[PDB]
Design a protein around this ligand. Structure first.
Ligand SMILES: CC(C)(COP(=O)(O)OP(=O)(O)OC[C@H]1O[C@@H](n2cnc3c(N)ncnc32)[C@H](O)[C@@H]1OP(=O)(O)O)[C@@H](O)C(=O)NCCC(=O)NCCS
Ligand SMILES: C[N+](C)(C)C[C@H](O)CC(=O)O
Length: 599
C-alpha cells in the first residue's frame, strides 16, 4: 500500500550548519565581487560561532524535524506558491507542449480527446488502487505523494494567501471531469453508475454533445478571471460565488478529476514562429481573443487539445513538479496509441450538464480587468522554442559525461559569451528520495564553471587545456547534483534558517540581509530538466524581470528546449540566448571531438 511505502522512506534531513555555509561561500565566489565576498565571509564566521545566532537557529530546525514528517514541506509550499501573489499564469504554472497529433477535423480532435481522457482514467486506476510502480533516483525509492495531489484537486484564491482543495479521497470521490469549449464549462461523468469507467467511444459521444451545446462563442470568458493577480482574483472569486449557480459551477470545476480544453481554430501564423505560438497557447492561451478564456488556471491539471492537432497542458504548480506530470503524460500518450478494441453497441448516455454563470456588471468588469492584465502579461513574454537536433544524451554519454551537467555547463558558457560574467543560476533538483520531498537548488554557476567559460573564450589557452576545464566543470556539477538529491545542498537549508529566525521572533540575521544573499537568490537563469519518453517539452516564465526561464527534455538523439524572457528588460532576448545555447553545445562537442580521450 501507499502508506507502507511512505513510512519506509527516510525523512528530510537538516544539513550541518557549517557544511552548508561552506558550500554557500563557494557558490558565491563566481557571482559576487571580491569585496562583497570578503564581507560575507566575515558574516558567516560570526553567524556560525559557538553560542551564536546560527547555532540556535540550526537547533530550532533540528527540533522542527523531530516534530514534523518533513521540516520543509509547509514552509516551501507556502513561500514558493501559496504566498506568491503574482498570477499563476506564466509566472508559476508550467505549460506542457506535446507532440502534434494527426487528426484533421472535428471528428479526430474529439476522438483523440476521448482517448486521452480514457488514458488519464486508466492512470488514475493505479492511483486509486495504490498500484502505481515505485520510482527510483540514484538507486533510492521515491516519494509518491505528488501523485495523490494532482487529480480531483484545485487551487483556491485567498485574500492573504491561497489554499488547495483535494477531493481524491473524500467520502464521495468525484466521478466527473470538466470540459470547456468556447469558454463554456460542462460537467461530464466519466464513470458508470456501476463504478466502471466510460470507454473512449462513449466519451466521444459525450464530447460530441458538449461541442454541439457550445457552438456559440458569445458567453463571457469567466475563466480568464483565474489569470489575474492573486489578490485581485481573490476578491473577484469571492464576488463570483455569491451567486447560487455560479458557486455550484465553480464547485464542479474545483472537484472535477481534471479539465479538458477543446480550443478553437486560431489565425494561421508564419512557420518560423509556429512552435513559439504553440508554446504560448499551452502556457497562457494566446489572449482574450483566442483560448485564454477557455481555461480555469486554478485547476491542477488542464489538458489542451487544439483545433489544428496541437496539444499539451498547463498544470498548477502547488501540487507537484514536472516528473510526476510527465509520468502521467507518458502513460497517457502511449495509451492513445493502443489498438481499437471491438466496441459493443452504444448504451444510453445522459446529457453532460452545462455549468452556467450569471454575469453581473461587476463580474463583467472583473472579466475586462482580467483581459487587460493578461494582455499586458502576454505582450511582455518573449519565447523561443529550440529543437536541438544535433545530438542528445548520446554524445555526452559517449564522452563519459553527465548529459544534464553537459547541458548546464553549455548554458553557463552561452550566458558568459553574451554577458561577460556569470550569474546566479537555479536548476531544480528532486528531493523525492525523502518523505514528502519536493525540490532543492542545484547552483550551476560555480568556481569550476567560471574557470571553464573564461578559458573557453581565451584565445591564449590551448584546446587540450580547455577540455580539462570542461570535464572539471561537468564533474563539479554532477557532484553538486548528487549532494542536492541527497538533501546535502544548502538553498532550502538557508531558507529554513531564515524562516526559523522569523518564527523565533529574533532580529533578521545579517547574513540574510547581506547583498551577497540578495544576489545569490536573484536567478537571472532559472532552469529545470523534465525527462520524458514522450517527445514533449515544458516552459515557464523567468523568475526575475531581467532573467530567463529555460526548460529542456534531453532525449537520446536530440534535446527539446524552451527559452523565455521578458521584453521589459532590454538586456534579455530569448532568441539570442537560444542561439548562443545551441552554439555553446556544438562548440563543446567540437572541442571534445578534437581531442579524443584515447589519443
Ligand atoms: C538533476 C537531475 C535532472 C539529474 O538527472 P540524471 O538522470 O542524473 O541526469 P544525467 O544528465 O546524469 O543523465 C542520466 C543518463 O545519462 C547517464 N549518465 C550520467 N552520467 C554519465 C556518465 N558520466 N557517463 C555515461 N553516462 C552517464 C545515466 O546513466 C542516464 O542514462 P539513461 O539515458 O539511460 O537514463 C535529477 O537528479 C533531478 O533532480 N531530476 C528532477 C528535476 C525536476 O524536478 N524537474 C522539474 C522541476 S518542476
Ligand atoms: C520552474 N522553476 C525552476 C522556477 C521552479 C521548478 O518548476 C520547481 C522547483 O524547482 O521547485
Amino acid at each position: 500500500s501507499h502508506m507502507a511505502h511512505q513510512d519506509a522512506l527516510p525523512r528530510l534531513p537538516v544539513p550541518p550548519l557549517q557544511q552548508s555555509l561552506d558550500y554557500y561561500l563557494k557558490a558565491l565566489q563566481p557571482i559576487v565581487s571580491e569585496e562583497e565576498w570578503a564581507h560575507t565571509k566575515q558574516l558567516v564566521d560570526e553567524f556560525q560561532t559557538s553560542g551564536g545566532v546560527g547555532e540556535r537557529l540550526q537547533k530550532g530546525l533540528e527540533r522542527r524535524a523531530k516534530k514534523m514528517e518533513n521540516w520543509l514541506s509547509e514552509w516551501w509550499l507556502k513561500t514558493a506558491y501559496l504566498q506568491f501573489r503574482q498570477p499563476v499564469v506564466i509566472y508559476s504554472s508550467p505549460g506542457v507542449i506535446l507532440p502534434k497529433q494527426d487528426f484533421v477535423d472535428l471528428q479526430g480532435q474529439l476522438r483523440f480527446a476521448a482517448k486521452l481522457i480514457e488514458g488519464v482514467l486508466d492512470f488514475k486506476s493505479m492511483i486509486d488502487n495504490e498500484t502505481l510502480p515505485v520510482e527510483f533516483l540514484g538507486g533510492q525509492p521515491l516519494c509518491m505523494n505528488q501523485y495523490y495531489q494532482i487529480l480531483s484537486s484545485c487551487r483556491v484564491p485567498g485574500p492573504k494567501q491561497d489554499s488547495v482543495v483535494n477531493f481524491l479521497k473524500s467520502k464521495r470521490p468525484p466521478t466527473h471531469i470538466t470540459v470547456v469549449h468556447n469558454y463554456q464549462f460542462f460537467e461530464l461523468d466519466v464513470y458508470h453508475s456501476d463504478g466502471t469507467p466510460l470507454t473512449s467511444d462513449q466519451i466521444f459521444v459525450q464530447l460530441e454533445k458538449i461541442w454541439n451545446s457550445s457552438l456559440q462563442s458569445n458567453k463571457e470568458p469567466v475563466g480568464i478571471l483565474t489569470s489575474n493577480h492573486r489578490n485581485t482574483w481573490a476578491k473577484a472569486y469571492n464576488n463570483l460565488i455569491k451567486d447560487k449557480v455560479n458557486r455550484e459551477s465553480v464547485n464542479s470545476i474545483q472537484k472535477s478529476i481534471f479539465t479538458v480544453c477543446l480550443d478553437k481554430q486560431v489565425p494561421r501564423v508564419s512557420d518560423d514562429v509556429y512552435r513559439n505560438h504553440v508554446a504560448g497557447q499551452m502556457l497562457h492561451g494566446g489572449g482574450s481573443k483566442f483560448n485564454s478564456g477557455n481555461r480555469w488556471f486554478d485547476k491542477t491539471l488542464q489538458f489542451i487539445v487544439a483545433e489544428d492537432g496541437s496539444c499539451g497542458m498547463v498544470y498548477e504548480h502547488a501540487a507537484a513538479e514536472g516528473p510526476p506530470i510527465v509520468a502521467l503524460v507518458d502513460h497517457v500518450m502511449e495509451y492513445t496509441k493502443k489498438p481499437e478494441l471491438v466496441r459493443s453497441p452504444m448504451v444510453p448516455l445522459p446529457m453532460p450538464k452545462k455549468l452556467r454563470f450569471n454575469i453581473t456588471p461587476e463580474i463583467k468588469n472583473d472579466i475586462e480587468k482580467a483581459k487587460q492584465n493578461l494582455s499586458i502579461m502576454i505582450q511582455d513574454l518573449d519565447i523561443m522554442m529550440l529543437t536541438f537536433h544535433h545530438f542528445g544524451k548520446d554524445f555526452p554519454k559517449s564522452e563519459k559525461l553527465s548529459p544534464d551537467a553537459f547541458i548546464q555547463v553549455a548554458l553557463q558558457l552561452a550566458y558568459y559569451r553574451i554577458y561577460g560574467q556569470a550569474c546566479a543560476t537555479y536548476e531544480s533538483a528532486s528531493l523525492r528520495m525523502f518523505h514528502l520531498g519536493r525540490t532543492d537548488t542545484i547552483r550551476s554557476a560555480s568556481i569550476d564553471s567560471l574557470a571553464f567559460v573564461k578559458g573557453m573564450g581565451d584565445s591564449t589557452v590551448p584546446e587540450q587545456q580547455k577540455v580539462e576545464l570542461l570535464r572539471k566543470a561537468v564533474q563539479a556539477h554532477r557532484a553538486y547534483t548528487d549532494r542536492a538529491i541527497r538533501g546535502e545542498a544548502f538553498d532550502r537549508h538557508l531558507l529554513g534558517l531564515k524562516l526559523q529566525a522569523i518564527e523565533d521572533l529574533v532580529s533578521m540575521p545579517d547574513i540574510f540581509m547581506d547583498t551577497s544573499y540578495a544576489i545569490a537568490m536573484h536567478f537571472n537563469l532559472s532552469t529545470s530538466q523534465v525527462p520524458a519518453k514522450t517527445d514533449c517539452v515544458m516552459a515557464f516564465g523567468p523568475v526575475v524581470p531581467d532573467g530567463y526561464g529555460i526548460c529542456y527534455n534531453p532525449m537520446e538523439a536530440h534535446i527539446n528546449f524552451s527559452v523565455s524572457a521578458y521584453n521589459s528588460c532590454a538586456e534579455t532576448n530569448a532568441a539570442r540566448m537560444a542561439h548562443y545555447l545551441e552554439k555553446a553545445l556544438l562548440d563543446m562537442r567540437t572541442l571534445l571531438q578534437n581531442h579524443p580521450r584515447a589519443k
